[PDB]
Nucleic acid binder design. Structure first.
Ligand SMILES: [Cl-]
Ligand SMILES: [Cl-]
Ligand SMILES: [Cl-]
Ligand SMILES: [K+]
Ligand SMILES: [Mg+2]
Ligand SMILES: [Mg+2]
Ligand SMILES: [Mg+2]
Ligand SMILES: [Mg+2]
Ligand SMILES: [Mg+2]
Ligand SMILES: [Mg+2]
Ligand SMILES: [Mg+2]
Ligand SMILES: [Mg+2]
Ligand SMILES: [Mg+2]
Ligand SMILES: [Mg+2]
Ligand SMILES: [Mg+2]
Ligand SMILES: [Mg+2]
Ligand SMILES: [Mg+2]
Ligand SMILES: [Mg+2]
Ligand SMILES: [Mg+2]
Ligand SMILES: [Mg+2]
Ligand SMILES: [Mg+2]
Ligand code: NA
Ligand code: NA
Ligand code: NA
Ligand code: NA
Ligand code: NA
Ligand code: NA
Ligand code: NA
Ligand code: NA
Ligand code: NA
Ligand code: NA
Ligand code: NA
Ligand code: NA
Ligand code: NA
Ligand code: NA
Lengths: 119, 46, 237, 194
RNA sequence: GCACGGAGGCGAAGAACCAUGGAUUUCCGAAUGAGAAUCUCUAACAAUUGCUUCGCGCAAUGAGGAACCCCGAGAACUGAAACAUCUCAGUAUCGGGAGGAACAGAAAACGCAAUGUGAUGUCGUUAGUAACCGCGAGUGAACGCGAUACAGCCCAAACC
RNA sequence: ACUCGUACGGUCACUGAAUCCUGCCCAGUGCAGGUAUCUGAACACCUCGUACAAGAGGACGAAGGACCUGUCAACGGCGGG
RNA sequence: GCUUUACUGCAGGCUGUCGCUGAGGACUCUCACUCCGGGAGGAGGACACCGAUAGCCGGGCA
């Protein structure tokens, strides 16, 4: 809500998660907000995921601004357990990271662009 | 005044304690009920 | 010093409370979703122990039966209407805006929805003077010019039982009976008749208040007796 | 580099600025309609929570507690009391609002014991604090090395004995030096002079 | 049984008596299905929680105890030759709670200033000293030393 | 609480049925209203001062008061020459 | 025990100021907060309420 400065259509969102699944099998992904946050600082990230249904918000409020001053592209996901599940987890996840994707470095790139245009 | 099944038992005990010490306990101890409660002179509880 | 009688009242003991359990009902207007369709019939005319004034029993269409504040001129068999498009007949309850200027009205709402507040006692009435999209100026029985939201409902006509005050009680017995049906301590012992301990005007070798009767608004309870914040007294001048 | 936690901790250093302030102004609205003792599922201040003892385990409970703002709701003396003891408005309690919160909570959850507590905002007529409680009868914690001790009998109803962290702070037992003459080892064994 | 009568019975199948473990153990009582001056009415962890197969399924609290202990609330007579600060006194009394003991406790310490000591209680002393006080009445420590008993530890985060 | 109440009310006081009437005084005291100017605390604002602080001073100024009016079926008064 | 223009206080009332508390010496607005409404919404609006402080009054009370 407060850190969410734009709305992401359902389909585009579906595309992100589809990619996240093959990425966890081919490249590398990071689960949980701590690991994900650390990537944005180490630079080893390419695309980040942030759930919109996070309470308390504080756990995430830092992602938008932190990723923007490091160039690293991002995206808003509705559900939590969808991101959690999508990252190959049984639980849920406030945020996951795309630390070098796999078999979708093209799709990922395009997605990161559609968002850049989505403002 | 009406009473309860309970009260009616209490009154009864209160009346049994009001009997004298058996003439036989007299001889066994070789020698007085300190709790003799008259109806008019004394007052029970309740 | 002991607490004065005015302070005992605040506790709300039995002696001071009103005989609620004996009372009939709180006379409020009818809540209508809208339309104004609501209409009923005057079944009977009763006496409300709480206001000494009359009261009209009414039965609506949808089955509702509720006693309402009976203005003057309503009888058994008559018809009343509640809503925006209600007819301008004595007793019909509707917002101030719909009511034509210069017509006597009673049981006026202080805020729309509350169900009435002003002009309720024996033979009184308000007076609708002005109209606007924003305001509605009413003249309350005390003479004050009350500015109101034109959306506030109000009943047309004067409150029944007019002329009660006109005839004296004649005897203590009769007053006593009136007071018993109210949350008021009666009779009343003048504070000057009490002891020094019991009230500021108490004590002394004779009956007189040692302090001047008028008193400041700012005074604490326990001393706030007599002529309160009087803007003046007497009649002379 | 900096952990995700360190962000939440920093944000809370000035709860009147930025996103947190926009957050406080929101929640608080929903917080004022909520009861006194409400069990929330997750700590607002995750960092502080963890840094106090928090763990995402079975038997670890958190809860927010709202208390009226103010001074001694002290009634005036009815009998004869000299000028000095004639106070009602000014004088305040010797027990801080945070500690009052811990108790209202421990009571609400009888069987649970109080780990720690922490502030989570305040408006013009109330203050909020969250509370970490633990179920000392749950095997998870009886087996957890890091919390095990809370099960000890002599830890029962600890918040009420002032054994909290917020308790010892209120009792004037912070500094092991100057000033602690009248507080260590306890207020009662020092004749209550602090 | 006390309790030494009368009648009778028990004990060598080792009674009584004592020790330890066990059985039974009415109703009220924190009293808990609900109501009640110890009884009643038609299946029960009442109430609040926790885990939860989300079913009271597994559990927790409640109340007592001579005083001691811990956190809160906190007098006045009285002393000051009156009396308001002060004193009595953080005493009496009240509220909540723990154990067999409590509490405190491994320095953001001490500051015999040092090249020095090294968790915390408690005892002795320092000392009626320093400090406070209508500078009146009165209140009144610490570091240190000498002893007792000694004991040291774990998270949070970085990095996984 | 008053209040299932709404000024033809309920609160607060005095006087105490009906009848005939109830004079003069607002100086003081009280309550209420106004008030150019005068008085009037603290924060913030200024200068001074202190590498900070204590503290000295400046400006502004609320209620209240001064000042004026109202008021006695308000406390109360109704003389001497 | 009672009284008062006895000494010292205290509730309480009035008042400035601080926070709650936001948008563009006089003014607009709405989002906090208030009240009414069953609701939709209506009214008030950074005021009121409440916490702190300051000055005046203050036998109602000690
Ligand atoms: Cl009357
Ligand atoms: Cl506890
Ligand atoms: Cl040493
Ligand atoms: K004294
Ligand atoms: Mg009503
Ligand atoms: Mg009359
Ligand atoms: Mg009555
Ligand atoms: Mg009288
Ligand atoms: Mg008399
Ligand atoms: Mg008096
Ligand atoms: Mg007289
Ligand atoms: Mg008189
Ligand atoms: Mg029972
Ligand atoms: Mg004395
Ligand atoms: Mg004396
Ligand atoms: Mg001790
Ligand atoms: Mg002296
Ligand atoms: Mg002392
Ligand atoms: Mg020392
Ligand atoms: Mg309401
Ligand atoms: Mg006195
Ligand atoms: Na008898
Ligand atoms: Na008098
Ligand atoms: Na507890
Ligand atoms: Na102290
Ligand atoms: Na037994
Ligand atoms: Na149980
Ligand atoms: Na259950
Ligand atoms: Na003396
Ligand atoms: Na004396
Ligand atoms: Na030495
Ligand atoms: Na002194
Ligand atoms: Na005069
Ligand atoms: Na005058
Ligand atoms: Na006396």
């Amino acid at each position: 809500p407060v850190y969410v400065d734009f709305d992401v259509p359902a389909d585009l969102e579906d595309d992100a998660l589809e990619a996240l699944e093959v990425a966890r099998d081919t490249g590398a992904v990071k689960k949980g907000t701590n690991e994900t946050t650390k990537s944005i600082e180490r630079g080893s990230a390419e695309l980040v995921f942030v759930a919109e249904d996070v309470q308390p918000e504080e756990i995430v409020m830092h992602i938008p601004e932190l990723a923007d001053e490091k160039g690293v592209p991002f995206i808003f996901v509705e559900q939590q357990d969808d991101l959690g599940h999508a990252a190959g987890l049984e639980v849920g996840s406030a945020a996951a990271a795309v630390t070098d994707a796999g078999e979708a470095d093209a799709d990922v790139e395009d997605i990161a662009d559609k968002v850049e245009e989505l403002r | 005044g009406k009473k309860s099944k309970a009260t009616k038992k209490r009154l009864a005990k209160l009346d049994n304690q009001n009997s004298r010490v058996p003439a036989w306990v007299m001889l066994k101890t070789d020698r007085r009920n300190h709790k003799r409660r008259h109806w008019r002179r004394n007052d029970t509880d309740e | 010093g002991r607490r004065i009688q005015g302070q005992r009242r605040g506790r709300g003991t039995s002696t001071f409370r009103a005989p609620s359990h004996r009372y009939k009902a709180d006379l409020e207007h009818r809540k209508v979703e809208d339309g104004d369709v609501i209409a009923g019939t005057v079944v009977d005319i009763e006496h409300d122990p709480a206001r000494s004034a009359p009261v009209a029993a009414v039965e609506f269409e949808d089955g509702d039966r509720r006693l309402i504040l009976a203005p003057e001129g309503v009888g058994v068999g008559d018809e009343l209407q509640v809503g925006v498009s209600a007819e301008i007949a004595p007793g019909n309850t509707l917002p101030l805006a719909e009511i034509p200027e210069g017509v006597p009205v009673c049981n006026v709402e202080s805020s729309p929805g509350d169900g009435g507040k002003f002009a309720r006692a024996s033979g009184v009435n308000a007076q609708l003077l002005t109209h606007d999209r924003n305001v509605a100026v009413v003249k309350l029985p005390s003479g004050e010019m009350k500015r109101l939201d034109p959306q506030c409902r109000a009943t047309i006509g004067v409150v029944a039982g007019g002329g009660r005050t006109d005839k004296p009680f004649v005897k203590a017995g009769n007053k006593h009976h009136k007071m018993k049906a109210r949350g008021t301590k009666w009779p009343n012992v003048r504070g000057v008749a009490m002891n020094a301990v019991d009230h500021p005007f108490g004590g002394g070798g004779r009956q007189h208040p040692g302090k001047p009767k008028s008193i400041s608004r700012n005074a604490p309870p326990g001393r706030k007796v007599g002529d309160i914040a009087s803007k003046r007294t007497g009649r002379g001048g | 580099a900096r952990s995700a936690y360190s962000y939440i901790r920093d944000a809370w250093e000035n709860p009147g600025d930025g996103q947190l302030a926009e957050l406080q102004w929101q929640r608080q609205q929903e917080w004022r309609n909520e009861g006194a003792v409400e069990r929330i599922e997750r700590p607002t201040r995750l960092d502080k929570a963890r840094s106090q003892g928090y763990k995402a385990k079975q038997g670890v409970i958190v809860a927010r507690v709202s208390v009226r703002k103010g001074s001694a709701r002290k009634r005036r003396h009815k009998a004869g009391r000299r000028s000095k003891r004639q106070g009602v408005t000014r004088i305040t309690r010797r027990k801080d609002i945070q500690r009052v919160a811990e108790e209202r909570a421990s009571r609400t959850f009888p069987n649970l014991r109080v780990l720690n507590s922490y502030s989570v905002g305040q408006d013009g007529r109330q203050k909020w604090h969250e509370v970490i409680l633990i179920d000392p009868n749950h095997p998870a914690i009886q087996n957890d090395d890091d919390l095990s001790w809370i099960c000890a009998d002599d830890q029962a109803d600890r918040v009420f004995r002032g054994l909290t962290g917020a308790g010892r702070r209120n009792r004037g037992l912070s500094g092991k030096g100057k000033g602690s003459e009248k507080t260590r080892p306890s207020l009662r064994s020092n004749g209550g002079k602090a």
